[PDB]
Amino acid sequence: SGFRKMAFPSGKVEGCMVQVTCGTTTLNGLWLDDVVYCPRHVICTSEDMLNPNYEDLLIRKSNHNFLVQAGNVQLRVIGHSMQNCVLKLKVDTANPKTPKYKFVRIQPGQTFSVLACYNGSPSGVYQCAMRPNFTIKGSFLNGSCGSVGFNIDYDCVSFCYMHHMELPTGVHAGTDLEGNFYGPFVDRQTAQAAGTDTTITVNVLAWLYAAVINGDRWFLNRFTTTLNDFNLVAMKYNYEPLTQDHVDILGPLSAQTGIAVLDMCASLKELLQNGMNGRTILGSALLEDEFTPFDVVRQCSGVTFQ
Amino acid sequence: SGFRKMAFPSGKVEGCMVQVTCGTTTLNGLWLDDVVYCPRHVICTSEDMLNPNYEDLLIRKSNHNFLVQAGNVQLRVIGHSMQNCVLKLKVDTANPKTPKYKFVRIQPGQTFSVLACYNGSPSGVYQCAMRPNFTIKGSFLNGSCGSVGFNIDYDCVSFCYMHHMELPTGVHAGTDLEGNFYGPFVDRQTAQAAGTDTTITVNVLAWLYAAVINGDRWFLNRFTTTLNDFNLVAMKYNYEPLTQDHVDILGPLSAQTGIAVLDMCASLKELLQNGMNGRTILGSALLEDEFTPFDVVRQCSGVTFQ
């Protein structure tokens, strides 16, 4: 038993991390087959950031201006192009460590593992959620740009996130691996509004089921509620609306625990209206929302990979 | 910026995980050079658990009774022995993926990453602390035994923990890689007392420095205190005594932030006596104690490995 915020094993992704340098800027790249992917602002100087014309800046670059380091191997760059906000460098050697992989654009509320890297070398791995407002609450220092987020399904790494920037509020923003930002953000050093975040209600419910499975059950009340009545409470507390699709997704956890979803909603309603009164649930004094229903099922069924 | 509970990149450890079977029992083993390490209770049946005579049980086994699976390769077992609570199986092939490694026995309050595994295959990775009472609060299902905890220093994996059991209270217990349990525990399916746990005070202070570094600073008060006066508060709240060795370890964080350690103790005193009043620190509504001072320095200096 026990329940922890667990990241995927990172070895498959470690073997794909390279160092990309163009001018004075060095960041991380992702090396799959004979292509290296990285944020296009690798070509920006200091002045360039406030108002970059990426097309004009890229035209001043040729293949030999991009230095790509894989540990200590050089890839020769034999072509380059810009795809949205990512640069794709064609190299002369396919990564011998390329895992089975896919590029996916995840939905808000979904979770993934981040392999934080600096100068092309992995530093650490942690799990997090794409917020409803398309930011992530990560741990990214200078040089972490180009670090990736991912999920694993048996042998297949599904890359979904590449890190580009920290907003002036200190939250993090980035793209899918086709270079399209999540959210309204642009790769410009300007102040940018993330907008109101909300709590991922279906994830909180999944975590409450995780808690029941693991013996923590004081919050189970002797009430039930309806969808419309619960959702009335959700909007007051900035929780995202609960749909029947959400109810269906919680089904297996409902069947395992013998607790109807709407009964669990009534417990969450009373938690939201009356607080936790200094108690804890799975070791936290807050309602946790970065576990999907699949995260929970996977953790207490012990699904493995490689 | 940002601060997250970060595990080490697990790739170096992934390549060492094997499946060990003896009779009906299958668990994880750790394959380094030509030796495989695993919990000795792999030789136990169901009845054996309550009162195992490990010496007598092991004598009924020969080399060919141990089935070792590395993905799909067999190691031939050419020798076996029991070292404290671990079994060491000599195999005919050295692991081609053996990292630079060491066996270390960690101190209570130190942290490490766990690579949770089932049937020899990695499932997930998370960070945690050896509690003062020599348990860990992990996530371990049936078949997770033999999963390891570890730290990395550049290229060297320092193995410090192998998982053996869940106590009836649901916390977790295990050994170093020489097979000596952390704590008073034995590998017997009996009820066993962990004893009173305490909060790792020096880790809480390191995390408060992490918070200041990352903009969270409401808790900084206009008080100071002394060691003896703070420690008086610590014992009332089951915090481990703060020593000058602890103060010295917090020095670099003191110098970075410009906050004397005893000034931070006075903030922690008022947090302990008056609660948090519904505020949060680095996203948590509780005082976090599973970050060492070195964890904090490493996270906000971006130290890398391999």
Ligand SMILES: *[C@H](O)[C@H](C[C@@H]1CCNC1=O)NC(=O)[C@H](Cc1ccccc1)NC(=O)OCc1ccccc1
């Ligand atoms: C890239 O490694 C780095 C990662 C930052 C530093 C600390 N935390 C992070 O997530 N980010 C950057 O340097 C980029 C650079 C850039 C260049 C050209 C166009 C857009 C961005 N930007 C960035 O994160 O700046 C921080 C910031 C904070 C507040 C307002 C503006 C910018």
Ligand SMILES: *[C@H](O)[C@H](C[C@@H]1CCNC1=O)NC(=O)[C@H](Cc1ccccc1)NC(=O)OCc1ccccc1
């Ligand atoms: C090994 O994979 C397994 C891991 C447990 C299961 C769920 N969570 C865990 O950490 N543990 C065991 O099966 C061992 C077996 C054993 C055999 C011989 C001597 C000692 C132990 N024991 C165990 O964890 O049992 C759980 C338990 C709970 C409460 C009281 C006694 C035992």
